[PDB]
Design an enzyme around this catalytic site. Structure first.
Site, PDB file in Angstrom:
ATOM      1  N   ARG A   1     -53.444  -8.729 -20.583  1.00 49.20           N
ATOM      2  CA  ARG A   1     -55.063  -8.265 -20.575  1.00 49.20           C
ATOM      3  C   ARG A   1     -55.547  -8.089 -21.534  1.00 49.20           C
ATOM      4  NH1 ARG A   1     -54.597  -8.837 -15.376  1.00 49.20           N
ATOM      5  NH2 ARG A   1     -54.601  -6.855 -13.801  1.00 49.20           N
TER       6      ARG A   1
ATOM      7  N   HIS B   1     -59.145 -16.091 -16.084  1.00 50.03           N
ATOM      8  CA  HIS B   1     -58.548 -15.174 -15.807  1.00 50.03           C
ATOM      9  C   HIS B   1     -57.881 -15.912 -14.309  1.00 50.03           C
ATOM     10  CE1 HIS B   1     -57.412 -11.065 -14.226  1.00 50.03           C
ATOM     11  NE2 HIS B   1     -56.803 -11.465 -14.375  1.00 50.03           N
TER      12      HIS B   1
HETATM   13  N1  LIG Z   1     -53.350 -13.330 -16.177  1.00 50.84           N
HETATM   14  C1  LIG Z   1     -52.884 -13.157 -14.965  1.00 50.84           C
HETATM   15  O1  LIG Z   1     -54.103 -13.837 -14.318  1.00 50.84           O
HETATM   16  C2  LIG Z   1     -52.310 -11.724 -14.503  1.00 50.84           C
HETATM   17  C3  LIG Z   1     -51.267 -11.974 -14.064  1.00 50.84           C
HETATM   18  C4  LIG Z   1     -50.526 -10.979 -12.969  1.00 50.84           C
HETATM   19  C5  LIG Z   1     -50.650 -10.059 -13.984  1.00 50.84           C
HETATM   20  N2  LIG Z   1     -51.345 -10.079 -14.898  1.00 50.84           N
HETATM   21  C6  LIG Z   1     -50.863  -9.067 -15.949  1.00 50.84           C
HETATM   22  O2  LIG Z   1     -49.619  -8.948 -16.552  1.00 50.84           O
HETATM   23  C7  LIG Z   1     -48.685  -7.176 -16.679  1.00 50.84           C
HETATM   24  C8  LIG Z   1     -47.495  -7.727 -17.001  1.00 50.84           C
HETATM   25  O3  LIG Z   1     -47.082  -7.992 -15.557  1.00 50.84           O
HETATM   26  P1  LIG Z   1     -45.271  -7.686 -14.395  1.00 50.84           P
HETATM   27  O4  LIG Z   1     -45.666  -7.249 -13.702  1.00 50.84           O
HETATM   28  O5  LIG Z   1     -44.693  -8.502 -15.605  1.00 50.84           O
HETATM   29  O6  LIG Z   1     -44.918  -6.148 -15.378  1.00 50.84           O
HETATM   30  P2  LIG Z   1     -43.615  -5.477 -15.741  1.00 50.84           P
HETATM   31  O7  LIG Z   1     -42.915  -5.768 -14.909  1.00 50.84           O
HETATM   32  O8  LIG Z   1     -44.347  -3.757 -15.300  1.00 50.84           O
HETATM   33  O9  LIG Z   1     -43.362  -5.275 -17.426  1.00 50.84           O
HETATM   34  C9  LIG Z   1     -44.108  -4.461 -18.183  1.00 50.84           C
HETATM   35  C10 LIG Z   1     -43.751  -5.130 -18.948  1.00 50.84           C
HETATM   36  O10 LIG Z   1     -44.346  -4.315 -20.559  1.00 50.84           O
HETATM   37  C11 LIG Z   1     -43.406  -3.125 -21.246  1.00 50.84           C
HETATM   38  N3  LIG Z   1     -44.047  -2.099 -21.473  1.00 50.84           N
HETATM   39  C12 LIG Z   1     -45.115  -1.533 -21.596  1.00 50.84           C
HETATM   40  N4  LIG Z   1     -45.628  -0.674 -21.741  1.00 50.84           N
HETATM   41  C13 LIG Z   1     -44.771  -0.578 -23.273  1.00 50.84           C
HETATM   42  C14 LIG Z   1     -44.880  -0.201 -24.406  1.00 50.84           C
HETATM   43  N5  LIG Z   1     -45.663   0.644 -24.986  1.00 50.84           N
HETATM   44  N6  LIG Z   1     -43.849  -1.365 -24.922  1.00 50.84           N
HETATM   45  C15 LIG Z   1     -43.661  -1.896 -25.197  1.00 50.84           C
HETATM   46  N7  LIG Z   1     -43.653  -2.449 -23.941  1.00 50.84           N
HETATM   47  C16 LIG Z   1     -44.182  -1.372 -23.135  1.00 50.84           C
HETATM   48  C17 LIG Z   1     -42.722  -2.953 -20.098  1.00 50.84           C
HETATM   49  O11 LIG Z   1     -41.315  -2.386 -20.722  1.00 50.84           O
HETATM   50  P3  LIG Z   1     -40.262  -1.948 -19.518  1.00 50.84           P
HETATM   51  O12 LIG Z   1     -39.160  -3.089 -19.566  1.00 50.84           O
HETATM   52  O13 LIG Z   1     -39.659  -1.100 -20.676  1.00 50.84           O
HETATM   53  O14 LIG Z   1     -40.363  -0.690 -18.996  1.00 50.84           O
HETATM   54  C18 LIG Z   1     -41.989  -3.862 -19.240  1.00 50.84           C
HETATM   55  O15 LIG Z   1     -41.048  -4.709 -20.295  1.00 50.84           O
HETATM   56  C19 LIG Z   1     -49.730  -7.068 -15.282  1.00 50.84           C
HETATM   57  O16 LIG Z   1     -49.485  -5.584 -16.387  1.00 50.84           O
HETATM   58  C20 LIG Z   1     -50.775  -7.891 -15.491  1.00 50.84           C
HETATM   59  O17 LIG Z   1     -51.638  -7.257 -16.667  1.00 50.84           O
HETATM   60  C21 LIG Z   1     -51.902 -11.215 -15.629  1.00 50.84           C
HETATM   61  N1  LIG Z   2     -59.310  -6.829 -12.594  1.00 52.82           N
HETATM   62  C1  LIG Z   2     -60.039  -8.007 -11.366  1.00 52.82           C
HETATM   63  N2  LIG Z   2     -61.470  -7.436 -11.490  1.00 52.82           N
HETATM   64  N3  LIG Z   2     -59.140  -8.622 -10.917  1.00 52.82           N
HETATM   65  C2  LIG Z   2     -57.193  -9.265 -11.440  1.00 52.82           C
HETATM   66  C3  LIG Z   2     -56.479 -10.531 -10.686  1.00 52.82           C
HETATM   67  C4  LIG Z   2     -55.844 -11.557 -10.776  1.00 52.82           C
HETATM   68  C5  LIG Z   2     -54.769 -10.626 -11.475  1.00 52.82           C
HETATM   69  O1  LIG Z   2     -54.465 -10.429 -13.350  1.00 52.82           O
HETATM   70  C6  LIG Z   2     -53.540  -9.606 -11.410  1.00 52.82           C
HETATM   71  O2  LIG Z   2     -53.794  -9.597 -10.234  1.00 52.82           O
HETATM   72  O3  LIG Z   2     -53.208  -8.418 -12.139  1.00 52.82           O
END
Ligand SMILES: NC(=O)c1ccc[n+]([C@@H]2O[C@H](COP(=O)([O-])OP(=O)(O)OC[C@H]3O[C@@H](n4cnc5c(N)ncnc54)[C@H](OP(=O)(O)O)[C@@H]3O)[C@@H](O)[C@H]2O)c1
Ligand SMILES: NC(N)=NCCCC(=O)C(=O)O
Ligand SMILES: NC(=O)c1ccc[n+]([C@@H]2O[C@H](COP(=O)([O-])OP(=O)(O)OC[C@H]3O[C@@H](n4cnc5c(N)ncnc54)[C@H](OP(=O)(O)O)[C@@H]3O)[C@@H](O)[C@H]2O)c1
Ligand SMILES: NC(N)=NCCCC(=O)C(=O)O
Ligand SMILES: NC(N)=NCCCC(=O)C(=O)O
Ligand SMILES: NC(N)=NCCCC(=O)C(=O)O
Lengths: 312, 312
Positions: free
Chosen positions: B227, B275
């Site tokens: 993010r 994104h």
């Molecule tokens: N750019 C894009 O297109 C895109 C797409 C999808 C997702 N994302 C982003 O990617 C993120 C991660 O997705 P995910 O499915 O991998 O999430 P997830 O499975 O919930 O994993 C989050 C990880 O972050 C760690 N974490 C959370 N708070 C923390 C803290 N305060 N200190 C240290 N570590 C911390 C967690 O620790 P624990 O394992 O110890 O709980 C966990 O290992 C999403 O939240 C989203 O914002 C971006």
């Molecule tokens: N926040 C907005 N408007 N779109 C995110 C879409 C892809 C993504 O990062 C997720 O699904 O986590």
């Protein structure tokens, strides 16, 4: 055993010592003009005719993957290397993984459209683009050898459809194998990405020309990791300008260094690296050479061996 | 069962029909303002307070990986989602492989110095560069979750040293696991490449700032896939300009679209994508949702579940 070593640019002193340690019964020396003392093995790159001519060597090891230059010199100077002498090259010795790094990085780069996003970034323009799909992204590998197979393998992980082209048929489970000129058109017809890992031989000179590029699907990509002579640079520029080829990444060129007058340097859809796709790992090369010598001595069957009649 | 569906931009009609087919005993409808008919499940992105408030839903499925926005809205409007209602997000459903494509491509790209070669190409300058070595290219993953682990896995193939950071300890055989703020400095100290896969939470806002970037080795690379709020953009620009950070590839930003006035657009060592790192695969999302509903119904233990107190 006696080993003579010649390389125009390598750290001759390092190599000599590393070979002594890897073959401790070996007397290893740097070959200089006038050295006509006995030798059992010669390790060479761009060797003077004088170094090899008339020697009944037990083997010659070319310190490169490609043997273009040394075979062409034997054509011009048949006195140079008696036909009794077996010729080896460096097989893999770390170049496979290097080819895999380069191909996987760049195939993914084109597949995720990082090229389009960079162009839009140059105008501060924010525009998500439609994602490409694997079914439309068949990857074809010209040459299915030590390096082609390694590259095919590392791309199979990413679930792209794969095909390869060679003289003889391959058995790789996930890779459709095309063989011979009679099948080249069919091979080319589906290739969204074309990766050249052919050797430089009279039969492959200029193979990437207008006639080949025209058979590719539109918006294809070219990745030339082999030799510059495989590509007719003006035909490629025409394909780039017509939109037939969307992007080309080239590591090798007819003239190296690529001279500043080449339009490739500044052409927009062209990426250039200065022949660095896969370089020798000296320790792994010394390992391959000492191991091969040991195998030749034990009468074991050895593979990495150039066929002078075939050309590679 | 009754399912209500709301998404501000998706193909509402496609999704409704795909859900009918995947759950044929389900009545599925698009939620419109004023619809206060009964619902068992709600599928939502950026939902109006009115859609959920006062419903004793059996579950809510956020149609995204990140739940930043919906949790922040529940803070502002506690009436919106009764604490009895379990909240799920999309776990993987194809985003893992997408994260792996992006990270592997770009890690390799920096590791093979394609950035330096492009700069030299821009001057028609031919100059082979010293190869980097893996021992000096430790990759650190901030966040070790569904996506972090997938990315760690796909990089292990390439033999880079790997470490991850999270709240709780991980057991991944090839990956040194750092946990908690008390270990963040140590984690950062060896990170040649830093990959952000954290969720957006009050505890991680602005975590990538001057103090964090200063602990990185020199000539580090930043890959932000999580993010925009995780990064303090002015601190990053200062690190880029001081040479602390050699390159940054950013997919996410505090303001999206990134407005034209941001210096990130035209900054030389910055790469921008709008994104698009990992987008929903609708068919896989429909598969995950129908499967989870089926598991909730059979009393089976289900995982992909947001902890509202924790924030993710
Ligand atoms: N750019 C894009 O297109 C895109 C797409 C999808 C997702 N994302 C982003 O990617 C993120 C991660 O997705 P995910 O499915 O991998 O999430 P997830 O499975 O919930 O994993 C989050 C990880 O972050 C760690 N974490 C959370 N708070 C923390 C803290 N305060 N200190 C240290 N570590 C911390 C967690 O620790 P624990 O394992 O110890 O709980 C966990 O290992 C999403 O939240 C989203 O914002 C971006
Ligand atoms: N926040 C907005 N408007 N779109 C995110 C879409 C892809 C993504 O990062 C997720 O699904 O986590
Ligand atoms: N850019 C760089 O840094 C760099 C580094 C290393 C190597 N290279 C180049 O890469 C080349 C390949 O190396 P390698 O070790 O993979 O060679 P290799 O193992 O000998 O494989 C060559 C492949 O090309 C095929 N081939 C040869 N002639 C052909 C023809 N006329 N028609 C169709 N296919 C033909 C062969 O077919 P069969 O299997 O049927 O025999 C074989 O599959 C080298 O020759 C070198 O020029 C470049
Ligand atoms: N592995 C690296 N750094 N370069 C490859 C070849 C150089 C070499 O063998 C020498 O000059 O002695
Ligand atoms: N031809 C010249 N001068 N150098 C090639 C070096 C790397 C390479 O491509 C190989 O070992 O095949
Ligand atoms: N997979 C592709 N091409 N886009 C992702 C999300 C779009 C979507 O779900 C809709 O608008 O209906």
């Amino acid at each position: 055993m006696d080993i003579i070593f010649y390389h125009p640019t390598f750290d001759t002193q390092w190599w000599i010592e590393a070979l002594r340690k890897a073959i401790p019964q070996a007397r290893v020396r740097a070959w200089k003009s006038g050295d006509n003392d006995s030798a059992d093995y010669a390790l060479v790159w761009h060797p003077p005719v004088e170094m090899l001519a008339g020697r009944d060597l037990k083997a010659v090891f070319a310190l490169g993957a490609g043997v273009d230059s040394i075979l062409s010199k034997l054509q011009a100077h048949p006195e140079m290397l008696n036909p009794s002498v077996p010729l080896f090259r460096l097989e893999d010795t770390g170049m496979g993984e290097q080819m895999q790094e380069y191909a996987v990085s760049q195939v993914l780069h084109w597949f995720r459209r990082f090229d389009d996003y960079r162009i839009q970034q140059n105008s501060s323009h924010w525009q998500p683009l439609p994602e490409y799909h694997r079914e439309d992204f068949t990857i074809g590998i010209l040459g299915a050898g030590v390096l082609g197979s390694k590259v095919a393998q590392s791309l199979q992980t990413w679930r792209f459809p794969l095909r390869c082209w060679s003289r003889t048929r391959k058995s790789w489970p996930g890779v459709q194998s095309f063989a011979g000129r009679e099948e080249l058109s069919a091979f080319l017809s589906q290739c969204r990405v074309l990766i050249n890992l052919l050797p430089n031989t009279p039969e492959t000179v200029g193979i990437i020309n207008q006639q080949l590029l025209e058979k590719l699907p539109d918006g294809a990509y070219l990745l030339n990791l082999a030799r510059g002579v495989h590509v007719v640079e003006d035909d490629l520029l025409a394909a780039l300008d017509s939109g037939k080829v969307k992007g080309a990444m080239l590591d090798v060129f007819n003239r190296e260094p690529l001279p500043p007058e080449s339009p490739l340097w500044q052409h927009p859809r062209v990426t250039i690296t200065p022949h660095v796709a896969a370089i020798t790992r000296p320790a792994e090369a010394v390992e391959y050479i000492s191991r091969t010598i040991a195998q030749l001595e034990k009468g074991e069957k050895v593979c990495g061996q150039v066929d002078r009649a075939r050309g590679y």
